């Protein structure tokens, strides 16, 4: 089963998920990284 | 009728209907040529018997599109 | 020999073929022989029917006088086709298989005509032709 | 008329006689060897500029090349 | 063959109205077939410019509305006559020589035309500003 | 007969692994990147690659049980926001100001003023989707109830998605069970349409209609019996329109007479709703059940009697048609492309007709006023309508090169027409020339003799006019008809041919669309653009498998780039690229249709009307003297229209002037791909893989430039994109603020 | 007579499939179907139209006469077979009609099925 997740669409948006998901929490958490305090 | 008068522009009306008839009603006819000829012995292609149908006819339709508009 | 008239197929119809280009110049013909009675797309539009035949119809041009053919030798099996192009209004007779076999296969007697013995690459500069007639990808 | 050229790489394939919708290629016996056979054109005065011939040589670079010229009504392939 | 079998294709009551028309008839010469040609195109012409003009409603629409009418009729002989040169390069001789086909008669066509198509326009401008 | 094959293939995540496993020059790798294209364009194209007329059935009967499935997950998406995320509990309570909404935004980065102050005590998107007014329509009172339609709707979800799995890799179904058309006409007239408005009958007496009256006279949401209760208690219904006292006995003696309270024939609009009186949609879908039902028993089976479609289009054939329909049964049975175009094309068409006849004759309650939401179901149905009218070109051009057989095929019909194609091309390109000259350059005129300052020579009203007069003797007859030829009717069919007007709140529900010169004016230019969309789609089919220029254009295929330069050049030749030129007039087609609709409402049919007794409208009548020139086309509907869409910036609308500018850029984008060619940007990526190969890290599977019809289709696919959702969002910013 | 009612595919399927044209059945059973069928409407009139209908009362007087006729009804279906089979005459066909040969129970298929019928149709309209 797990080959199917090797496939190049699958691993082209679950890649694209968390990276995605790492820039928005991180606004969530620290709003408005306009300039390195 | 901008540039004619109001009991003129009825002959346009009229005048079209018999070309109107003879148009569809002209080939529908089955005996043709039957007499008489034309006065002068024009060689021409209608008959006087059956041309006074489609001026009797144009003049039924005629009177139908004048006093339908 | 055209044999015309040869019998046509049995059609009525097609606005799309033969129209005033073939009374002024240049039509074509097409010659088979029928194994059975079967139907077939016309390139104008499509039914005849192959008759037993002496099977002839005056198509348009070369393309559709060939294209007839790579249609009839696959579908129905026969390839005894004998295209031609007209008299007067014409040029030459018997246009394919001009050399009684089919010219997809070789065979001795024929000549090479637009041969470049080179490559492509090979030919010359049109930098290196300037005001020269001789054609750049001509020997 | 088109002007249609047979380079010396043909490697006797026959695809691009096979290839042409107007019967304007056929294969004729080559001397280099006496076993295999060449493209020739000797109807180029029906040849449309198409290509369909160049799509079946087989060759890294085409042993059979087409070059437009001169445009004419049977090259235009009108039916009128 | 070439053409389609349909039930009405080359029925007779329009064949009686297209090989008696003043352009495929049989015996008329063509200085006489283009006059009737002329005298049916110009009458109908100077309908559309007297009553859908830049001026209608003044002395006046009529008037200027049929010199327009002819003054299209110009336009077409000029036309008829570049047709001419063009299609008769000394009157190519061809495979009917009717007045079209062949051309021995065009500015015979082309005059007589022209005839007609300053005659039947203002005969309308006679019908339409006078009765 | 129902003959089965039982597990033909089994359950297997190991074909997972192998993308083009379907296929034959695809199950062996990629050398270029196209193939990635290549495979994904041919995918659900199922006789590609399939050569068995069964097993290629087999698949299309699976996958539509999953395409069933996903609505239905759509569906439950919607019904499932319907109740958490919506206001929809606090508009029943008030349906007149406060404006539907669901799809609420996180609070994150600066997307939350688009939750704006809706009403309620609500912060969301509003919405315009009209499901509000289908669930007050239904008779939903409760927001439990909208959750567990959700459930609901998802196990049907699950529930279709393993039937598909049931009927392909277990029971898969043979030809002689697919070919059986006359008891599938039964069946799905009678089971699915039949019972279809029976049981929504059955619904909408029992559910709809009491607490739907109740709300007209509005007592409260809450005080609203469960619909359930109108079942149990006899009294409790009976209250109102008292015939459930008789019980079914007027229905079981033949005198139905005994229920003119509940199925009755109305015919307007309900005054306090501005809808349709749902009392005559429950006798309409009543009367639907019994036709469909009888229409259901019409078409042979394995009980001797019926209609059999073999028998009946031999005998229907007369001496202009030769063998009539002869063998045309024999294509709809063994051809799904040429059933999916006449599926499509009745099936759009029948959309379009749905987007005229909800906006005339508003179907729901509080949806007629709401102009957010009336506006949005006609623009999106006819845009939905347009879509499958072009896919009804496609697979009809897609029969004749593939699955059409002039064998079987002599003389008839398809024979017949492909016989005389010239003539009706030909005369198809007349008329489309003759409609832009005098539809289009009647507008040229106009906008000279504007420009000119000659009014008088102008096409108008005070001017030359252009009298509708059939359109206006058609607008009278169907107007004058409730109490002449519709007795029982007590007003018209609806308030858009004639009557007075009706107001919900203070807006107008209807009334009377007028058609002046400038409505003679637009209608043909819709009659110019649906006659080229029909003379690109139709010579797409006819010339599909030859023509005078190529007479072995079936050989090529139905998507082929060209022939090329030969002949002149043979540059889009091909079906396919017939159903990419149509495309575009089709978005030609309909978005003047919408330009139409939705500025000939706010300027003479939408609007506030006083407590006098007139309407002041929004755009002001400028339809009359402004439409009928480009200008006016220009500045008054689409300079002075889209004055909210860009001025939508820091309010709850600042969504929309975004996508109007993101449209602006995607519709940009497909200028690339239209105007250029294939030959151009294969060589940028030699000089780019080159520079790949210079690093030393150069990709295996080498790259090529995009195929000219992948080219064309990705020109064609960012135009509409841009194209529409221009449109979609300038509909939208404009009436949300105006209305 | 051949045109197009008595020839038409039609009929031929409904009249040879209705149990007195039927080949398979009996003559107990399609002495039942036809017991049956003219049984279950014969209430019908009746508890609609009577000597007495506005009462308790008019469903079972109304089906009182139903099962009335039904017993004449056996009397008139053996009064054909005293009559038109006396001595059990064949003919030159022999089926149920033509000569007896099941004569003596379809007498009273048609008592089981005729009286069974409005047994079965009183509990629709005055019960349930
Ligand atoms: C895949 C990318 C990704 C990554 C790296 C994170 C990372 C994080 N999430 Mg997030 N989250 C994500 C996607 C992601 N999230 C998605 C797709 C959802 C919707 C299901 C959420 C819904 C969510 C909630 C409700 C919460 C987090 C929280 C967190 C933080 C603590 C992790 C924890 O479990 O406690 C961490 C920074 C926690 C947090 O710190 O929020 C303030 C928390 O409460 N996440
Ligand atoms: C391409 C030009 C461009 C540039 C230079 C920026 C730069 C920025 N944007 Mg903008 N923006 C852009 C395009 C761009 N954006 C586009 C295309 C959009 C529409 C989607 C936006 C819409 C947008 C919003 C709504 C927001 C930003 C924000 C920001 C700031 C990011 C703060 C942050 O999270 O960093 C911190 C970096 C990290 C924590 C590490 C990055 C880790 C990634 C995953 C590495 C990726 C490797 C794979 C930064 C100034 C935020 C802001 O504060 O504005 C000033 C913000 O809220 N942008
Ligand atoms: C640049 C050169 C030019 C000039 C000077 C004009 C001038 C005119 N045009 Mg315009 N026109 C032009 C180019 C031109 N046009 C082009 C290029 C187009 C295509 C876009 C048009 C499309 C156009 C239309 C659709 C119309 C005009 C009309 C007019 C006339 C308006 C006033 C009028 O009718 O008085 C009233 C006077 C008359 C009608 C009679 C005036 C004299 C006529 C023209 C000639 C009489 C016969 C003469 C003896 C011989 C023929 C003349 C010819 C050989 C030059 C005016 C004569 C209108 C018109 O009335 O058409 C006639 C009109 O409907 N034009
Ligand atoms: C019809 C398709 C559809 C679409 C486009 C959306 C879209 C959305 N949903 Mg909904 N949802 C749907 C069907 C849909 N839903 C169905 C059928 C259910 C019932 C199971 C839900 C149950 C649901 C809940 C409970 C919530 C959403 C939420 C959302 C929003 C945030 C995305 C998210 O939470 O996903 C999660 C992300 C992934 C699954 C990717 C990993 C987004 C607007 C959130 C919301 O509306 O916040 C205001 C939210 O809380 N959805
Ligand atoms: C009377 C019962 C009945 C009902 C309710 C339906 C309902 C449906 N059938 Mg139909 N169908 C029926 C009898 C019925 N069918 C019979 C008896 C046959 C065989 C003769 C078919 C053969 C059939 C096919 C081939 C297809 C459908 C399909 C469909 C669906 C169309 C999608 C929609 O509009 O919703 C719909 C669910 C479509 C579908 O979704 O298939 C999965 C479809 O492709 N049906
Ligand atoms: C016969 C046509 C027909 C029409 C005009 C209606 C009309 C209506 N339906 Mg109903 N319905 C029908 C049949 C129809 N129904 C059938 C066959 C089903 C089972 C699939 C349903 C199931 C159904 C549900 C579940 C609901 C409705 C609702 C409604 C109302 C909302 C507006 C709408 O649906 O657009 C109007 C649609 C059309 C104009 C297109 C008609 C499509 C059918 C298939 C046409 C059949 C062809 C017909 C013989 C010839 C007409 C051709 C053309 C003129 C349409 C409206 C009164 C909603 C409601 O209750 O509102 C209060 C609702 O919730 N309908
Ligand atoms: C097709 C779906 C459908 C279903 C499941 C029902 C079901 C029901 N109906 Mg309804 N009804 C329907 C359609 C339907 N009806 C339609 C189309 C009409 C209009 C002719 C009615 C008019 C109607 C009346 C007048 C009555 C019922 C009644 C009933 C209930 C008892 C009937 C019984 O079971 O014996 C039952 C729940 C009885 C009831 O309980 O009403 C409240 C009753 O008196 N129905
Ligand atoms: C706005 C730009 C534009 C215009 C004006 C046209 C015009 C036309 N298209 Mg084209 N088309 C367009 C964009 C446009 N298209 C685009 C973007 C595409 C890509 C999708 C196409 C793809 C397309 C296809 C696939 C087809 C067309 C066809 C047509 C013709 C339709 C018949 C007609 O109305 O003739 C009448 C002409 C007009 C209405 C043009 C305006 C003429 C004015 C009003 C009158 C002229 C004034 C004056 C006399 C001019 C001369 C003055 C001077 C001599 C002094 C028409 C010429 C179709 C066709 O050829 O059918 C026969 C057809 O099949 N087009
Ligand atoms: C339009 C009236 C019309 O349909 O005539 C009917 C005629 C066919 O009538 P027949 O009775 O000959 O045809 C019977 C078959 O059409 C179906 O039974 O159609 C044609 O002649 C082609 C129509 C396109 C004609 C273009 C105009
Ligand atoms: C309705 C209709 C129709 C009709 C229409 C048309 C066809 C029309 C046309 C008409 C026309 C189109 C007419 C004409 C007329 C003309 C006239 C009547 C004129 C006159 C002329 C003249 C008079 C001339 C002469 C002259 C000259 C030449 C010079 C010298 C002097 C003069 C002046 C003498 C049809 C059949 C289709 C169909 C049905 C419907
Ligand atoms: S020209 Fe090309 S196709 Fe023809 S023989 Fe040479 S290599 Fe083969
Ligand atoms: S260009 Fe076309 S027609 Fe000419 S030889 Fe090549 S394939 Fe044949």
New binding site residues.
């Given amino acids: 089963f797990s080959k199917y997740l090797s496939t190049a669409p699958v691993i082209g948006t679950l890649t694209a998920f968390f990276l995605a998901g790492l820039l928005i929490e991180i606004n969530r958490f620290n709003p408005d990284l306009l300039v390195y305090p | 009728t901008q540039s004619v008068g109001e009991a003129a522009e009825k002959s346009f009306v009229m005048l079209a209907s018999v070309l109107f008839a003879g148009a569809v009603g002209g080939p529908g006819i089955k005996m043709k040529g039957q007499g008489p000829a034309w006065p002068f012995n024009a060689q021409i292609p209608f008959t006087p018997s059956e041309f006074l149908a489609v001026t009797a006819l144009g003049h039924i339709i005629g009177t139908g599109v004048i006093l339908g508009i | 020999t055209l044999n015309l008239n040869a019998p046509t197929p049995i059609f009525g119809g097609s606005t799309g073929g033969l129209l005033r280009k073939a009374e002024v110049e240049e039509f074509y013909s097409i010659t088979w022989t029928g194994k059975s009675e079967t139907v077939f797309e016309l390139p104008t539009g499509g039914a005849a029917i192959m008759r037993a035949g002496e099977n002839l119809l005056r198509l348009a041009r070369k393309e559709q006088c060939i294209a007839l053919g790579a249609q009839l030798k696959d579908k129905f099996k026969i390839t005894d086709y004998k295209i031609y192009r007209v008299y007067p209004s014409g040029e030459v007779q018997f246009l394919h298989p001009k050399d009684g076999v089919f010219p997809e296969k070789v065979n001795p007697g024929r000549v090479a005509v637009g041969s470049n013995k080179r490559r492509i690459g090979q030919n010359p500069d049109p930098a290196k032709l300037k005001f020269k007639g001789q054609e750049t990808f001509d020997s | 008329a088109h002007t249609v050229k047979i380079y010396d790489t043909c490697i006797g394939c026959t695809q691009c006689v096979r290839a042409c919708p107007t019967d304007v290629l056929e294969m004729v016996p080559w001397d280099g060897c006496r076993a295999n056979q060449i493209a020739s054109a000797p109807r180029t005065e029906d040849c449309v500029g198409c290509k369909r011939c160049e799509s079946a040589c087989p060759t890294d670079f085409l042993s059979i090349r087409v070059y437009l010229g001169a445009e004419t009504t049977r090259s235009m392939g009108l039916g009128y | 063959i070439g053409h389609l079998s349909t039930p009405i294709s080359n029925s007779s009551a329009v064949n009686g109205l297209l090989a008696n028309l003043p352009a495929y008839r049989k015996g008329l010469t063509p200085r006489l077939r283009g006059l009737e040609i002329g005298m049916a195109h110009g009458y109908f012409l100077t309908g559309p410019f007297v009553e859908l003009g830049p001026l209608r409603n003044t002395d006046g629409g009529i008037l200027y509305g049929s010199l327009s009418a002819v003054g299209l009729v110009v336009i077409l002989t000029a036309c008829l006559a570049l047709y001419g040169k063009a299609n008769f390069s000394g009157s190519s001789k061809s495979k009917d020589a009717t007045l079209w086909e062949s051309g021995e008669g065009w500015s015979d066509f082309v005059s007589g035309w022209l005839i007609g198509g300053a005659g039947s326009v203002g005969f309308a401008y006679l019908l339409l500003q006078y009765i | 007969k129902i003959v089965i094959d039982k597990d033909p293939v089994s359950t297997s995540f190991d074909k997972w692994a192998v993308p083009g496993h379907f296929s034959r020059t695809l199950a062996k790798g990629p050398k270029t990147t196209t193939w990635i294209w290549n495979l994904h364009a041919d995918v659900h194209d199922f006789d590609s690659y399939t050569s068995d007329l069964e097993e290629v059935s087999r698949k299309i009967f699976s996958a539509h049980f999953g395409h069933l499935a996903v609505v239905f997950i759509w569906l439950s998406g919607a019904y499932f926001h319907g109740a958490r995320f919506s206001n929809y509990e606090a508009w029943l309570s008030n349906p007149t100001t406060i404006k539907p909404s669901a799809q609420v935004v996180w609070p994150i980065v600066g997307q939350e003023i688009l939750n704006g102050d809706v009403g309620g005590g609500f912060q969301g998107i509003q919405i315009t989707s009209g499901l509000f007014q289908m669930w007050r329509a239904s008779g939903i009172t409760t927001e439990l109830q909208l959750y567990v339609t959700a459930i609901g709707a998802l196990v049907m979800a699950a529930l279709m998605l393993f039937a598909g799995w049931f009927h392909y890799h277990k029971a898969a179904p043979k030809l002689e069970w697919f070919q059986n058309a006359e008891s599938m006409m039964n069946h799905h007239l009678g089971g699915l349409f039949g019972l279809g408005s029976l049981s929504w009958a059955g619904h909408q007496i029992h559910v709809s209609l009491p607490v739907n009256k109740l709300l007209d006279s509005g007592v409260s949401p809450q005080e609203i019996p469960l619909p359930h209760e109108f079942i149990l208690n006899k009294d409790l219904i009976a209250q109102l329109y008292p015939s459930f006292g008789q019980g079914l006995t007027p229905f079981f003696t033949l005198n139905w007479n005994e229920y003119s309270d509940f199925l009755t024939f109305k015919g307007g609009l309900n005054p306090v709703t501005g809808g349709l009186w749902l009392s005559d949609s429950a006798h309409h879908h009543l009367a639907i059940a019994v036709l469909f039902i009888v229409a259901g028993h019409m078409y042979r089976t394995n009980w001797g009697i019926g209609h059999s479609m073999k028998e009946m289009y031999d005998s229907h054939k007369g001496p202009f048609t030769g063998e009539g329909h002869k063998g045309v049964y024999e294509i709809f049975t063994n051809s799904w492309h040429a059933q999916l175009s006449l599926n499509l094309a009745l099936f759009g068409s029948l959309s379009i007709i749905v987007a005229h006849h909800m906006y005339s004759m508003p179907p729901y309650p509080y949806l007629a006023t709401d102009y957010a939401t009336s506006l949005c179901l006609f623009t999106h149905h006819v845009w939905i309508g347009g879509f499958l009218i072009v896919g009804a070109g496609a697979h009809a051009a897609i029969f004749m090169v593939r699955d059409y057989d002039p064998a079987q095929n002599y003389n008839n019909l398809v024979d017949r027409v492909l016989r005389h194609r010239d003539a009706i091309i030909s005369h198809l390109?007349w008329v489309?020339?003759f409609?832009?000259?005098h539809s289009?350059?009647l507008y040229?005129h106009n906008d000279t003799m504007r420009a000119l300052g000659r009014p008088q020579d102008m096409f108008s009203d005070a001017a030359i006019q252009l009298q509708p007069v059939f359109a206006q003797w058609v607008q009278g007859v169907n107007s004058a008809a409730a109490g002449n030829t519709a007795p029982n009717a007590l007003a018209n069919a609806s308030y858009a041919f004639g009557g007075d007007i009706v107001s919900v709140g203070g807006k107008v529900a209807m009334m009377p669309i007028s058609l002046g010169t400038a409505d003679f004016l637009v209608h043909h230019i819709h009659a110019?653009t649906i006659h080229?969309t029909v003379?690109?789609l139709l010579k797409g089919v006819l010339f599909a498998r030859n023509s005078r220029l190529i007479p072995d254009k079936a050989n090529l295929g139905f998507r082929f780039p060209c022939d090329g330069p030969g002949r002149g050049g043979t540059c889009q030749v091909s079906a396919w690229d017939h159903v990419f030129?149509?495309l575009?007039?089709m978005y030609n087609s309909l978005s003047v249709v919408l330009f139409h609709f939705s500025w000939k409402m706010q300027s003479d049919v939408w609007g506030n009307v006083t407590a006098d007794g007139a309407v002041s409208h929004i755009t002001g009548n400028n339809f009359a003297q402004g439409a009928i020139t480009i200008n006016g086309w220009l500045r008054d509907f689409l300079w002075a229209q889209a004055s909210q869409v860009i001025q939508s910036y820091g309010s709850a609308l600042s969504a929309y002037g975004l996508m109007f500018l993101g449209a602006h850029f995607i519709w940009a984008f497909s200028l690339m791909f239209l105007f250029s060619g294939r030959g151009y940007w294969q060589e940028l990526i030699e000089s780019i893989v080159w520079a790949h190969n210079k690093l030393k890290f150069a990709p295996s599977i080498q790259p090529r430039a995009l195929s000219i019809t992948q080219g064309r289709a990705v020109g064609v696919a960012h135009y509409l994109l841009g194209g529409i959702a221009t449109t979609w969002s300038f509909f939208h910013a404009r009436i949300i603020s105006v209305g």
């Fill in positions: 390109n489309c020339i409609l832009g000259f289009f350059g040229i110019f080229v003379l690109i030129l149509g575009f007039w």
